[PDB]
Structures are given as C-alpha cells and as structure tokens.
Design a protein around this motif. Structure first.
Motif, PDB file in Angstrom:
ATOM      1  N   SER A 189       0.770  -1.111  -0.112  1.00 29.39           N
ATOM      2  CA  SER A 189      -0.068   0.131   0.058  1.00 29.39           C
ATOM      3  C   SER A 189       0.954   1.354   0.032  1.00 29.39           C
ATOM      4  N   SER A 190       2.263   0.982   0.520  1.00 29.60           N
ATOM      5  CA  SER A 190       2.945   2.367   0.466  1.00 29.60           C
ATOM      6  C   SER A 190       4.215   2.192  -0.467  1.00 29.60           C
ATOM      7  N   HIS A 191       4.432   0.819  -0.946  1.00 30.81           N
ATOM      8  CA  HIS A 191       5.469   0.507  -1.957  1.00 30.81           C
ATOM      9  C   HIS A 191       4.723  -0.199  -3.393  1.00 30.81           C
ATOM     10  N   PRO A 192       4.435   0.667  -4.177  1.00 26.70           N
ATOM     11  CA  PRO A 192       3.804   0.173  -5.453  1.00 26.70           C
ATOM     12  C   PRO A 192       4.476  -1.259  -5.785  1.00 26.70           C
ATOM     13  N   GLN A 193       3.900  -2.106  -5.902  1.00 25.21           N
ATOM     14  CA  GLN A 193       4.382  -3.445  -6.331  1.00 25.21           C
ATOM     15  C   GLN A 193       5.026  -3.665  -7.418  1.00 25.21           C
ATOM     16  N   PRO A 194       6.085  -4.472  -7.474  1.00 26.38           N
ATOM     17  CA  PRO A 194       6.920  -4.571  -8.723  1.00 26.38           C
ATOM     18  C   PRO A 194       6.372  -5.497  -9.536  1.00 26.38           C
ATOM     19  N   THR A 195       6.527  -5.336 -10.818  1.00 27.48           N
ATOM     20  CA  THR A 195       5.913  -6.262 -11.790  1.00 27.48           C
ATOM     21  C   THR A 195       7.178  -6.953 -12.474  1.00 27.48           C
ATOM     22  N   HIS A 196       8.241  -6.555 -12.547  1.00 26.73           N
ATOM     23  CA  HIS A 196       9.610  -7.098 -12.930  1.00 26.73           C
ATOM     24  C   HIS A 196      10.502  -7.415 -11.782  1.00 26.73           C
TER      25      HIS A 196
ATOM     26  N   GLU B  84      12.997  -5.093 -10.478  1.00 29.76           N
ATOM     27  CA  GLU B  84      12.693  -3.922  -9.575  1.00 29.76           C
ATOM     28  C   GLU B  84      12.850  -4.325  -7.974  1.00 29.76           C
ATOM     29  N   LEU B  85      12.918  -5.407  -7.702  1.00 30.29           N
ATOM     30  CA  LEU B  85      13.258  -5.737  -6.291  1.00 30.29           C
ATOM     31  C   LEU B  85      14.469  -5.058  -5.779  1.00 30.29           C
ATOM     32  N   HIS B  86      15.135  -4.563  -6.566  1.00 27.40           N
ATOM     33  CA  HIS B  86      16.399  -3.811  -6.012  1.00 27.40           C
ATOM     34  C   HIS B  86      15.868  -2.407  -5.327  1.00 27.40           C
ATOM     35  N   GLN B  87      14.744  -2.327  -5.694  1.00 24.37           N
ATOM     36  CA  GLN B  87      14.049  -0.905  -5.486  1.00 24.37           C
ATOM     37  C   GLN B  87      13.369  -0.977  -3.861  1.00 24.37           C
ATOM     38  N   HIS B  88      13.275  -2.296  -3.491  1.00 29.59           N
ATOM     39  CA  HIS B  88      12.541  -2.578  -2.308  1.00 29.59           C
ATOM     40  C   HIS B  88      13.273  -2.851  -1.135  1.00 29.59           C
ATOM     41  N   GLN B  89      12.816  -3.008   0.205  1.00 25.82           N
ATOM     42  CA  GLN B  89      13.239  -3.572   1.199  1.00 25.82           C
ATOM     43  C   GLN B  89      13.011  -5.154   1.130  1.00 25.82           C
ATOM     44  N   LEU B  90      14.100  -5.917   1.252  1.00 26.30           N
ATOM     45  CA  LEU B  90      13.968  -7.272   1.169  1.00 26.30           C
ATOM     46  C   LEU B  90      14.243  -7.891   2.361  1.00 26.30           C
ATOM     47  N   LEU B  91      13.554  -9.184   2.610  1.00 27.77           N
ATOM     48  CA  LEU B  91      13.772  -9.807   3.878  1.00 27.77           C
ATOM     49  C   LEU B  91      14.000 -11.319   3.493  1.00 27.77           C
ATOM     50  N   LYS B  92      15.045 -11.919   3.879  1.00 31.93           N
ATOM     51  CA  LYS B  92      15.749 -13.025   3.375  1.00 31.93           C
ATOM     52  C   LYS B  92      16.176 -14.060   4.505  1.00 31.93           C
ATOM     53  N   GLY B  93      15.779 -15.241   4.243  1.00 35.15           N
ATOM     54  CA  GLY B  93      15.971 -16.309   5.242  1.00 35.15           C
ATOM     55  C   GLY B  93      16.768 -17.503   4.380  1.00 35.15           C
ATOM     56  N   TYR B  94      17.601 -18.062   5.356  1.00 35.04           N
ATOM     57  CA  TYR B  94      18.409 -19.220   4.745  1.00 35.04           C
ATOM     58  C   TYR B  94      17.367 -20.306   4.427  1.00 35.04           C
ATOM     59  N   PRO B  95      17.600 -20.941   3.360  1.00 37.60           N
ATOM     60  CA  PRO B  95      18.410 -21.200   2.250  1.00 37.60           C
ATOM     61  C   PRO B  95      18.410 -20.089   1.080  1.00 37.60           C
TER      62      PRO B  95
ATOM     63  N   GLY C  25       9.041  -5.480   4.335  1.00 37.24           N
ATOM     64  CA  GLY C  25       9.557  -5.831   2.835  1.00 37.24           C
ATOM     65  C   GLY C  25       8.909  -7.055   2.149  1.00 37.24           C
ATOM     66  N   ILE C  26       9.672  -7.375   1.096  1.00 35.44           N
ATOM     67  CA  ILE C  26       9.252  -8.711   0.288  1.00 35.44           C
ATOM     68  C   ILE C  26      10.128  -9.803   0.500  1.00 35.44           C
ATOM     69  N   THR C  27       9.604 -11.017   0.788  1.00 37.18           N
ATOM     70  CA  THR C  27      10.355 -12.252   0.919  1.00 37.18           C
ATOM     71  C   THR C  27      10.138 -13.235  -0.090  1.00 37.18           C
TER      72      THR C  27
END
Lengths: 288, 290, 288, 290
Positions: C170-177, C180-191, C230-232
């Motif tokens: 709602s505050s970060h327009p969804q990426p369609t490519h 575009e993930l580089h433009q977003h806050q990303l959350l990452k878990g092993y592996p 962010g996006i995971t």
C-alpha cells in the motif's frame, strides 16, 4: 562485502572510467554500477561519481583504495604464479597396485614411464586389497575388479588358466573335466582359492578343496607348480614365459574362469598436476 | 577466477567442512560445492579432496591456502575496519539468538526496531544454546541462562516459566497425574533444552524425569505441535503456550510442580566501543517491554 | 573347516542316513559326501560309512558329535529367535529433517504416524544442512535437494514464492519485474538468500542484495514480512495460511524460482526392523 | 542361512574391516562382501553399516554378534582342539614368512618338503616384517632380524648380504660413485625394508642415505627390475641378485661399502608341544642347506 566487487572497484579507479573498466572485463557498466553501488552499500560508504565520464573518489575512498589496491594487485599475480607452479609441478607421485600382478604386468609400463621422465618419482605400494585405501592418499590406484567417486578406466584384462608341469602330468593323467580336479593335488594362491569354471556347454564346476599348497601370493604357487607338485589356476599374464619355454603346460583349456578386468583409478586428469597428467596419459597411450 | 570463491575456499579450510562453513556464512552447502568447483575449473586445479566426512587439501590446495591466506586476512580486516566505523543510524548489525524463543519472544521487538530504523539492517543467526560463540563476531548476543562472564556486558531482559501441559484429548484417555512421579506412566514429549525435567512441588518434593519420551526433538515448537495432537505431556515455556492455554486446546497439569525459571539475557561489548547503530539497538531493547 | 559342512554332518548323524539328510535339505548326497569327505579332510579325521544305507561313527566321531551337536542345535534356534526379535523390533527411531520445513510440512505426518503407532518413539533432529550427516546415525533422513548410497525417494516438492503484506504494498507500489526488487526492502532467510527468478519469456534475474533483514531461519523472516517490512521469498508450504487469511500477498507470480524437491533417505526397507519399515510405509502411503 | 557366513560376519566385526578380514582369511574382499550380503538376504536383516572406511553394527548386527559369538567361539575351539591332535605325517601346517625373500630363498626348501611329505599341506602367508604376529596362530614363523623373544624357540637358518648394484647402461651415463657420499648425486631405487641405507667402508667411514629415491616400492623384486632397466642404484640382498650379477646385466658398485648382514630365523613352539607334522617340518628345515 564481496572481494570481487572490491576488485572491480579497483579496476575502475586504475582505469579512470566505467567505460574503461567494463570493456577490459566483459562486464556491462550498470552491472559494475549495480556492483559498485552494491559495494558502497555493504561498506556503508560512497565512492565514484559520473558527470558523463566517471571519476574522482571520496576522502575515505582514496585512503581505502590506496590501502587495499596494493594487496589486491599482489593477489592477482600471486594466484597466477601459484597456478603455473602447481599445474607444472614435477616430483613424487604415489601409486597403489595389485601385489600379484605388478611385477610382470605393471613394471614394464612403470619402467618405461620412469625412463621417459627422469624428474618424476614414483612411490609404489603393492597390496592384495584396494578396497580400504583412503583414495586421498594416492595419485593413482590400479586394481582388479571394479569399485567409486574416482574416475575408473579399464586398462587391461587377465585370463586365469590351469597349468601343471610335464613331470606332474606324466605321473598323473591329465583331467579333461573340471570335476576331476578333486582327484588331483591342487596348488592355490590368493585371490584364486575358490575356482569357478565353466565349459562350452554351460556346465559350471566349483572347487574349494583346501589345496596341497595354499599361499597369500601367486608367484610362490607358480614355483610349487613348476616343481611338479600339482595343478594351479593362474593369470595368463603371470605364466607367459613358462608356457612359452614349456616348463608349464595348460590343461582343461575348455574350462574358463571369469576374466578379471584391470582398472586405473584417478581424479579428473586435467585438474591434476603435470607429474600425474603425464603418468595417466602414458598409461592410456601404453594400453591403446 | 573469483577472489570470493578463493576466499570461500580459505573459509572452508578454516572451518574444516562445507556444513560447518555453510552454518557460519549462511551459504547452502550445494552453493558452496558449486563455487569451489567453479574455482577449481578456473584454475584447472583440484584444490580439495572430499572423502567420507573428511576434507583434505591437495598439494595445490595446500599451496593456495598457505600463500594466499595472509593477503585475504589483511583485506578482510581492512574492509571490516571500515564498516566498523560509525555512520550514525545506519549499517548492518549482527545478532545471535536462541532457536526456541526468538520467533515469539524477540521478533516483535526486532520488528519494531527495524520499523523505527529503516537504514539499519539486521543479520540474525539462531542456534540452540550449545556451543559458545566468539563474542567478537557479534554485535549483540541474546541467550538463555548465565554466560561465561567473559568480556561482555550482560543485561537480563526477561524470563520464562516452563510448565507441563497436555491436550484434553490426551487427558480424556490417560487420567491426569497428581504427582510428578507418575510421569513415568505417561507419554512424554520433550524438546531441547528441556529434556531432563527437574520439578519441585510446594512441599519441597522434587522429581527428576529423564525418560527419553515418546517424542524427542531438537526444538520445542514441533513438540508443542505433537502435544496439541494429544500425543502426551510436555514441559514448555509459558510464553510459547498462552494462545493454546486460552483455547481449551492445551491444559496445564501438575500445576503445583514447578521448574526453575530461566532468564533471558542480552550481551554486548561496552557501549563506549560501540557504534551508533548498535547503541540505538541496545537502548531500544532496554526500553522495550517484553 | 566349514561350520556348514559340520552342521551338514550333524543332520546326517541325527537322521541316520545320507538318504535321510539330503531329502530334508535339498542337497544331493554325493555333495553331502563330497562335503563330509571334505569335512573329514579338513579335520584330518574320518567318520560315516556306507553299506547300502549310511551309518555308525568312529570312536572320535561320537565324542566329537556328542560335543559339537548341542552347540550347533542351540545356534540354529538362537539365530531364529534373534531374527524374529530384530525383524519385529519396536521402540526408538532416529530421524533428521530440514529445520525450516519440518514444522508445517513434516509434523502433521509425524504426528499422524505417532498416533497410529504408540510403541514407536521418534527422536527428531532438525538441521539446516544434511550433507555432513553420518548416515549410520540415522534411520531416516529427510532433505531438500538430492545427494548417495542410501535409497533416495522423492516425497514432495516446494515452490518458493514472493510475498509482502498489504500494508507494505500500500505504501510501496508492487513490482511487476524482478529487477525492480532492488528498489524494495527485502527480507531473506536461509537457504533462500540469493534469489534466482525466471519469467515466461526465459528472462532470468538474480538478486543477491543483502536484505533489510537476513536470518538463518525462514519463520522469523515470514514474521518480519507480516509486519510490512518488505518482500520475501518463501516456500509456499510455509505460507499457506497467511496467503489464505490474506495477511500476506503474492507478488511477481510470473517470476518463478527453481522448484525444490523433498527426499526421504533410508536403507533397504525390507531389511529394516519393524519400527522403521512401518514408518517408511507410512510416509509413502501419506504421499501417494 | 549359512553358519559360515554368520561366522564370517563375526570375524569381520572382530577385525573391524573387510580388508583386514580378507588379509587373515585369504578371502577376497569382493567375496566377503557377497557373503555378508547373502547372510543379510537370508535373515532379511541389515547387520552392518559401511560408511567411509568405518564399519559399524546395526542394532540387529549388535544382537547377532553379542549373542551368537560365544557359541561360534566354542565351536571353533572345539574343532581346532581336534585338528591340533597328531595324526602322524599328515595334516596342514601354517607358516608365516617375509614377502621379499621367500620365493627365492625358501620355496626350494618348502617344495622339497612337500615333495617328501605328500599328505602334509602347507598354508603360507607372506608379509613385510612390520606388525608382530600372534604366535599362537602359526605353526612356524620365518622372519628377518631378531624377534620379541616372547614364548618362542628361535633358530638362525641363514643370512643375507645386501649390496649396491646398477645396470651397465646406467653406469655408462652416470659414472660410478667412488664414495657412498656421492649416492646423493645418483638416481636411487629403494624397496622396503631397505629404505635407509647405512653403509660402512673398510676405513670405518659410514654413510647414511635416506634420499626418497627415483623409485620407492613396498617390495624389492620390482626394484631389482627397475635397476635392470638402468634407472639407477639399489641396495639389495646378494641372494636376490646372483643370476643378474653373473650375466653382466647388473654390476656391483661401491664394493668396499657394506651394509649390516641380516639374519634369517625360524621360530616355533617347543617341539614337546608339537605334533608330528610340525616336528618333521622343523627337522627338515634344520637339515636343509640354504
């Protein structure tokens, strides 16, 4: 932080532009940028800027470049030198080979190899068994029968045949059927203690008689056989000269034993040092 | 040839295995294997032998490790020396925390912190208490129980009360025990680190239960799950259980029998040697309720 | 000397004839003879004799039979009992399973198994990595990706998908490519730290951004994602309920990650004790 | 189910590996593997795990070993107790002898013995000196060098003089050394147990050469062969060499430099506790020249 991003940055500084850096490496400029901006983020510190051309540095970027640049340079040339030295390495190779067969089957190969390459030294262990060898302790393993993560190439094959001396046969009518072996004095050497023989008609005969003489090695059994003490089963490759000079005679020739394959086990030849690549190539050449 | 793969090779040698290395770097084993292969392919040289569990160096591997290591160490120091420098409310912070309690007990707090500080990034590693860490490798360590005391400020931020529970379905078919000694007759479900139950009632009677259990696991969440399915009695931190205690889906048993309360500590290097990003975090935890 | 020849001799004595002994065992009489005469030779001592029927014994043959007979009998029944006890064995089984997936993907299976078989106890170790497990320490290993001497059966498959909370989007327009993930806050878990994504057109995108939040386990990352941080990238099997209750939303659905296979590793089921055979059968049943 | 396979399983556990077991029994590893498989197939039970080099028992294997072993031991004792009894000039005798010298030095004698005693059978095991044997497992042990002294009659039956030789082809291209110190400049060929050359001249000068060698092998016959091909200088028992010394195909070098003579012993348990078959053998050796 990625050391390769950090080296990509150095290539950038040394060059003076992203244009200059990307053309030498075959790596697109935004990728560099993506990666230098990646490097900036990981270090939490900024660097190069673009007008049209790229250039300059920050106060901490110069100090950092001046600091890491010399170490990165050395690394690039150190790794190259080590590579040439390891790929080109001569000296000692360690080999395991089957105890029985090595003398007559392997040594002429090994001898020819050594004559050809005086700077390659062979350390040779002969064993009755290869199954418990730590493969990390050997450059090349030669074994009878197959094994498993090592490359396995078949280099040869032995045919085990039945023989006795003319003096023995002269007093003990030759057997024409393998069952008749029970009526004879048998001489048996490891690993050919239980004889499994098949004839043209598919008849199979098994002989696990103890043996007048039973030994952990076949060469001493062959000796016993030459003195007329009985019949033995023995690799044709251990018998060639005795067959030829006529002091040992083949019996039961219609009765064959399972042929046994000789394998050379080694690691990916191209990633081996020179001394080992040369040896592998030699054996292959010798056997084709 | 990628210097990062060469560096990765160095780390593999130092740790002594891919799994050990995978653990420290969060690089999957398969990717480590792939990257070592790529390194070898670029040099046309085999660097490592892998037999059994045993990892050993070829002659070439031996030469690369000995010779290149020092330079790779200096570079690492050098670049860490930079990122150790304070850029205010930004940068990455590295936290170690226990496997069991973090999700429920600490994530609300960690989340609230990240929300407040969008330029501060968190790397979070979870592990059972077990092995001791090199404290110099972390910005903040959260642990259960007292530390070695060594070179670290410790602060108690919470505690857990471990209690015994079963599902009504289980109790329907296996009448509640009235004394902890009776646990030997029941189906027990145990998760590390609560394997050896040490229980004391208000009269001072104490029972030690070290039965293996119908179900033993290396973490408590899967055990609660078995407990909800009516498979027996488990001992489990109150905090991991209030949801289920509220719905009649887990009920406390042997309420007069208690276990030693366990403290939750935050440990860190004194704040005088601490960048702003870590100071903000530390102060945030201290001010946070739960 | 061959213990089986020696037992064949006992069957002969107890019976009283070679006729009697051969018919019960399905082993021709001369073979017996071949073997008893073999046994005689190895012991260097004679035994039974044939008129038409076979019979009797020697002075030392009786003493020897009387001596070894009782031990051989016991052995035959001891081995049979041990066999039934080991094939029928209940009790503890040891299992390893992937840390991330076990709770939501494995536990309902394990729970159902345990409810079904109250006398089978499970000891469960959850690990991020299976590659360094001594296979001799586990009855069954569940792992992600393939390995190697253990039987490997694929039992399932996970699809990793990209998600964020409605508050985040709602505050970060969804990426369609995926770039575009580089433009977003990303959350990452092993592996799942290095994301490798491919779209319908074969376009591949790689993302190795550090991540606002990076953790050794995915469950805490999913939590961060629910708080709108962010996006995971996360196994669909870990997300089912959040997708369904709508607190997490799939983005970039045209961009797929490599599917990851779940394997069960075990030794030849038929040669396993009851407690392990039942578990293997159960899992197979559960998954077909 | 074959009791011999069960027995073989027991022996595998006692020795701790297939190769170790193969060595003692003269059963090839492949056949051992096959027979253990057959045992497992007959029980429908896995008995052993094989990971790396490490052999370990399953629970079933553990139960079979512990429970059945005692009976298998008693049976073995029992049947050996019989074959230990003297039947005159007949039976099998078990001999241990060194790998290097047996073929040339001892087989003539062993052959003559078998010829004279056609009902006495010989089981002959060859090994490098190396590990010490359990003497109770052998009727006669032939060895080089002095024994532990333990519980055994020893008799010297011979000795060997080790000498240095090269092919004329080799010397043609690498001028003979005149002092043992010069061996460092030459191509050396070494076979166990003559790896460390300890040489003394008539003046009392002594040289120790522990160069690795162009060729190092675990037995001397393959080394003589390399020497005949002109690949360098080796140290080698006179007896293994007279054929070649007579044809000009190997020539002695550094003749003034000698090595310690090495004794050949026959060891056995006192003849009072010895069956006839072994006594005849012992007396035969004693009376035999060479």
């Amino acid at each position: 932080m990625k050391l390769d991003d950090l080296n990509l940055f150095r290539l950038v500084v040394e060059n003076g532009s992203y244009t200059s850096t990307s053309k030498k490496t075959m790596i697109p400029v935004a990728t560099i940028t993506r990666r230098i901006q990646a490097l900036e983020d990981s270090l939490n510190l900024r660097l190069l800027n673009r007008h049209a051309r790229k250039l300059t540095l920050t106060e901490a970027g110069e100090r950092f470049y001046k600091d890491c640049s010399p170490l990165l340079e050395r690394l690039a040339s150190m790794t190259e030198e080590i590579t040439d030295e390891c790929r080109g390495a001569s000296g000692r190779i360690r080999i395991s080979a089957p105890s029985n067969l090595t003398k007559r089957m392997m040594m002429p190969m090994f001898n020819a190899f050594m004559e050809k390459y005086p700077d390659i030294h062979i350390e040779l262990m002969m064993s009755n068994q290869a199954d418990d060898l730590d493969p990390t302790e050997w450059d090349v393993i030669f074994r009878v029968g197959p094994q498993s993560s090592l490359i396995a190439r078949k280099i040869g094959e032995v045919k085990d045949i039945l023989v006795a001396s003319p003096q023995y046969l002269s007093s003990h009518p030759q057997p024409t059927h393998a069952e008749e072996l029970h009526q004879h004095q048998l001489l048996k050497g490891y690993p050919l203690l239980k004889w499994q023989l098949t004839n043209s008609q598919g008849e199979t005969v098994v002989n696990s008689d103890r043996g007048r003489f039973q030994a952990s090695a076949l060469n001493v059994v062959r000796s016993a056989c030459s003195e007329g003490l009985g019949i033995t089963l023995m690799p044709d490759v251990m018998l060639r000269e005795f067959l030829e000079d006529g002091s040992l005679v083949q019996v039961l020739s219609d009765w064959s034993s399972n042929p046994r394959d000789i394998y050379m086990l080694y690691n990916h030849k191209d990633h081996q040092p020179e001394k080992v690549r040369l040896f592998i190539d030699f054996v292959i050449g010798y056997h084709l």
